[PDB]
């Protein structure tokens, strides 16, 4: 048992988000599956479950927008969330749950998926523009970098010199700018390096893009 969520990492406001859960090492007719999400900086939030018999329960606050179904055939469980807003941006987790019934009700999560971040935004998939940075104009050490500008959605990956350069590399978490697009930056501090060469390697999987930007260390 591992659970795996699949679906879009980005969807537009008012549309319907639809996720699938598979990756199962057991039968849906033997165990209940739950969905749990976590909006950024919020607590875990229950969405609902479907038991072995296909009976569903839902978070009562969210229920009007939620649909969970399954098909034992393909060992797949679905979630749909209707009329999405930015409040629906979250990491979505598929789970297996213990649900059982002095008359007290038993609940716990047995197994957790890895989770899939989904962002709800008016912005659609946008590959970054990469710009070279140098601190020069602000010293035996120069700091170089790359600005990874105006992309959607997360994530972005940065290496230097194809992975050869790791020491003194610091890549920062992104900011969401007033544009509605993300930017993040990677920097490297170089002790020199007269004819040594510095290239940042940016990957934005959602747009299927890789960018190499050469950055001038001269100062």
């Amino acid at each position: 048992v591992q659970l795996r969520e699949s679906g879009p990492s980005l969807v537009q406001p008012s549309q319907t988000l639809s996720l699938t859960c598979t990756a199962s090492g057991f039968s849906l007719s033997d165990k209940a599956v739950g969905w749990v999400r976590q909006a950024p900086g919020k607590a875990l939030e229950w969405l609902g479950s479907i038991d072995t018999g296909g009976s569903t329960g839902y978070n009562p606050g969210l229920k009007s927008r939620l649909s969970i179904t399954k098909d034992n055939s393909k060992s797949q469980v679905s979630l749909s969330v209707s009329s999405v807003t930015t409040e629906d941006s979250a990491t979505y987790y598929c789970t297996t749950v213990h649900q059982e019934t002095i008359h007290s009700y038993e609940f716990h999560v047995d197994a957790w998926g890895r989770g899939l971040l989904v962002t709800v935004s008016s912005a659609s998939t946008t590959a970054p523009k990469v710009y070279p940075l140098s601190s020069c104009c602000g010293s035996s050490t120069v700091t170089l970098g790359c600005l990874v500008s105006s992309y959607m959605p997360e994530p972005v990956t940065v290496t230097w010199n194809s992975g050869a350069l790791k020491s003194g590399v610091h890549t920062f978490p992104a900011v969401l700018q007033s544009s509605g697009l993300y930017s993040l930056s990677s920097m490297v501090t170089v002790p020199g390096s007269g004819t040594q060469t510095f290239t940042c390697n940016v990957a934005h999987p959602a747009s299927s893009t890789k960018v190499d930007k050469a950055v001038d260390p001269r100062c």
Binding site: L44, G57, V97, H108, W112, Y131, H170, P173
Partner: protein, 215 residues
């Protein structure tokens, strides 16, 4: 409908006894099948406790839990580095398929000495400026505790428009980082004598400056 209320924050030093409360009502916690979950940085949650008191497989026995009435408590007997994480209780309410998670607790392990921020300020690239855009990037690293404030200045006056600043995030070396971006037109950049990023950390300010005429 119900709410499981936890402290927002808890802290201690290595080896100390730390507790996390989870207060509900007779319809949730009071019914006695509380569970607990840990979420370590950049990992899916893991189950710690179920049925008020049982420990999940593989969880160290410094973790224990109990319940009295409508309040459940998770206790870590000897706080370990790896225990810096977010913690959540949960309970069914009125139905085994209606789960309520608690509001969540961030646990920090104290120990790190104070460390000031390193600040690097980058001016806009020529390539960006060609696009009629200028982004100044202030990168802030290796500070502890994880709390900085950022003020941008142009010729000694404060700018607030078109600034986005991150909160502090944990680095792999257990200090913190943050960044700030000021988005200008190429004209506003060029029009000023100097721009400054001024980072304050617990009352002490590290300032970096760039002058368009030199950059």
């Amino acid at each position: 409908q119900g709410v499981l209320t936890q402290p927002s924050s808890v802290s201690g030093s290595l080896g100390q006894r730390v507790s996390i409360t989870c207060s509900g009502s007779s319809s949730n916690v009071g019914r006695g099948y509380v569970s607990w979950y840990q979420m370590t940085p950049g990992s899916a949650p893991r189950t710690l406790i179920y049925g008020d008191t049982n420990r999940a497989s593989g969880v160290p026995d410094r973790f224990s839990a109990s319940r009295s009435g409508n309040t459940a408590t998770l206790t870590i007997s000897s706080l370990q580095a790896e225990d810096e994480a977010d913690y959540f209780c949960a309970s069914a309410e009125g139905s085994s398929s209606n789960a309520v998670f608690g509001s969540g607790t961030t646990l920090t392990v104290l120990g790190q000495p104070k460390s000031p921020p390193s600040v690097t300020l980058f001016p806009p690239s020529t390539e960006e400026l060609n696009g009629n855009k200028a982004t100044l990037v202030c990168l802030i690293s290796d500070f502890y505790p994880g709390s900085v404030t950022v003020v941008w200045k142009a010729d000694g006056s404060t700018i607030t428009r078109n600034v986005e600043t991150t909160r502090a995030s944990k680095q792999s070396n257990s200090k913190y980082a943050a960044s700030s971006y000021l988005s200008l037109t190429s004209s506003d950049w060029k029009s000023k004598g100097s721009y400054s990023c001024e980072v304050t950390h617990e009352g002490s300010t590290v300032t970096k400056t760039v002058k368009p005429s030199e950059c």
